[model samples]
Target: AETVSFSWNKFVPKQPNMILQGDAIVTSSGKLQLNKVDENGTPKPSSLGRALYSTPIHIWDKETGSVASFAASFNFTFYAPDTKRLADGLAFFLAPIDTKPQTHAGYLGLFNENDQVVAVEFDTFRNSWDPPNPHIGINVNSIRSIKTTSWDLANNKVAKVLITYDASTSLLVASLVYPSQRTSNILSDVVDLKTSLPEWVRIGFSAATGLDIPGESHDVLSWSFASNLPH
Candidate 1:
């Protein structure tokens, strides 16, 4: 049996093991800045961003196709500069190594049309097909979540989230906690990672924004990951 684990108490600029894509960066305050507005702190629309571990993580073995269990937890926060509106949110996802995100806002920078990823989304803005409230969802390949909970964790507050996948049961669970809030919330589903993703994948964050809310910011404050596979 093999075990893999890593933790980031805070992110610093040019931290060698991390990779950032699109507009994502490690801010001066030691946080993973997922998406940003105009470079001048004003309004600019339709922005997309992503950040991830530098190397591929084992998901399943190509030889025997055995799905390995894993867990990831992170602290995140997001807000609108105007304080009146919020655009799209972000997701913790596992995708093909070197995956480029789709260009749409509602996609959360994870789904490209459909079929090739597994993600847990912290959704802020509600689209027409959404559940009519701010929610967290479990998604597999498609933007239409397989399960959703109106936990509403993406407000202008910080959140600690934990997600786990059990290979034996094929159960995926996502849990959310806010420091000042009393109760915690959870969402879950049954997803077969071996069928949905590649043997080795990039595990990371994906976020995008639409025109209505440009100055909003999404930040990842801390993170950790563990798995039954070898590190």
Candidate 2:
């Protein structure tokens, strides 16, 4: 199997083989931080952020006529503001290079109409089109999620998220856990990669804040990914 991992243990101006786009930054504490609560004690609206793994992961091999099975895991936190307000949220996505989402509140900095992408979103604030409360969503091509689950989160709490896809079964499974609270949540759906996705794609994270709501920080503590490789 082929594997890639990021502990985010230190501040590197650039992570090797990765592209830092928009407001995503490496903190002195060695974590990947998407945004900070702006000065004047207000959240900065339209603060779009992205940290993309530039190297494409091979999902299908033409010569071998094979598809890959993969798993991804990460630890992340949404920093709650002192004023008890939060806007927008974060997402882990895989997309074609051409897909550049609007870097603003609704787009999550990963997708727009120009391209198609798959995203697992951790949504905080509700938009006019969104379901109420914080939730987890699986989005294909657009921000409209196919499946969603409510997620209850508190300030400065760390959560673990895991996603796995199996080519043989064409099933995609996801789970979220709060290590501190010892609680877990799960969701699953069928996804046909060969039909819906390209052979090559970039995998990464994106985040954003909205104008009408208060905002919080999104931070990643660590990430790991694994995939089967063609011989």
Which one is best on TM-score? 1
Cα lDDT, all candidates: 0.80, 0.76
Which pairs clash inside model 2? Answer: 101-111, 101-112
Deviation in angstroms for 168 in model 1?
1.6
Clashing pairs in 1: none
lDDT by residue for model 1 over 51-73, one digit each (tens)?
Answer: 87977888888777577899999
Clashes of each: 0, 2
lDDT of 2 by residue, 1-231 (tens): 444444443446556766777878886667887765565634566677788776688877667767788889888887656435677889998887655556577778766545567888888878776898888888877787888888867667789899998888878888999989888888788776766678777888998876565577787878787778545
Model 2 accuracy (lDDT, Cα): 0.76
Q: Alpha-carbon error at 57 in model 2, in Å? A: 0.6
